[PDB]
Amino acid sequence: RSCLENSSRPTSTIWVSMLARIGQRIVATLPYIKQEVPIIIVFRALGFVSDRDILEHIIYDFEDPEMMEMVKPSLDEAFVIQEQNVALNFIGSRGAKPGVTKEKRIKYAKEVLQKEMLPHVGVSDFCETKKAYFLGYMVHRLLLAALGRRELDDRDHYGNKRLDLAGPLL
Amino acid sequence: RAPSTSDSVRLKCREMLAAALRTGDDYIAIGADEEELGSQIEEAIYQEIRNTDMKYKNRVRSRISNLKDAKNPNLRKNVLCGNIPPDLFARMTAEEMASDELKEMRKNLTKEAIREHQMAKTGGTQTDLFTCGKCKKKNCTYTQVTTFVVCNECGNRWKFC
């Protein structure tokens, strides 16, 4: 649940889930996007054509192949997306208000990919790097949870809760 | 004496069996006819199967591997010494042909699995002071919580307040 700081827009949610079941195909539920999109297409849309860069942002160490076997399926799933334009078109095609043309869809995709998702890291003109690193950290945490190396996060743990006193409520 | 066969597959199987039986030179020490033993084994296999299909070839290969296994030459020595008749060896299974150590390990694993498959018995203080009304016996076990009565032999379940 991302939220910059008492901003006009409401808090945005980013569900980076994974199919149970090829098997082990990671997806994402971006705001204002009814369907799901794989994380690899999102990374390419943020401005990362190279695969090595995407993996480095997601996975920090390459000496553990046991972790690499989990991302290979989803990585190879989206093999027909290399350039940034096609990724932007694919992400915008699933938008709530699909533009009748191609330019409108690209603009809508760039706006949702720079203002709606993860507004707390940054919503300025050039902040794609930090957004990509945060997304890679989310994927890394998801993979660690899947491997069981790190227990899940309890929902009732007050350490992950915040109280809204009269201030924020008003 | 095993009857001769004119089938090429049978002859090849007999030759392979004889060659495998010759591993380790145990035949010379025992003075047993390796060729005759191989012919008898092939004849027993052919009688059991009655066709030179894939099953017969698989059985022949398994027998050759078991007889030529360097990890348990005792089976080969016993076969060449008459301890295991050719009919028994041909009809024997993989578990029976295993070495003594392998057989002991398999038995231990099976016993451990059988024990682990069981369920823990219900705990309780067994005593003969309560007479079960469902069987007339005195053996039973009680549990205080009201004291629940559990029959030992008959299994009468009751409680006393």
Binding site: - | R115, E116, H117, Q118, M119, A120, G123
Partner: protein, 49 residues
Amino acid sequence: SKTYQDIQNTIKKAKQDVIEVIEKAHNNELEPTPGNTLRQTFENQVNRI
């Protein structure tokens, strides 16, 4: 005033027994009870004690 002594002795004995069970589990001696895993049988033994 004597029942208190008996209760304290029993509690200390139970504590010693559970500590010994924990030590055995740590050093890998407590074999898994049939029908249950190692943690399950450990918890069952502790609860019974």
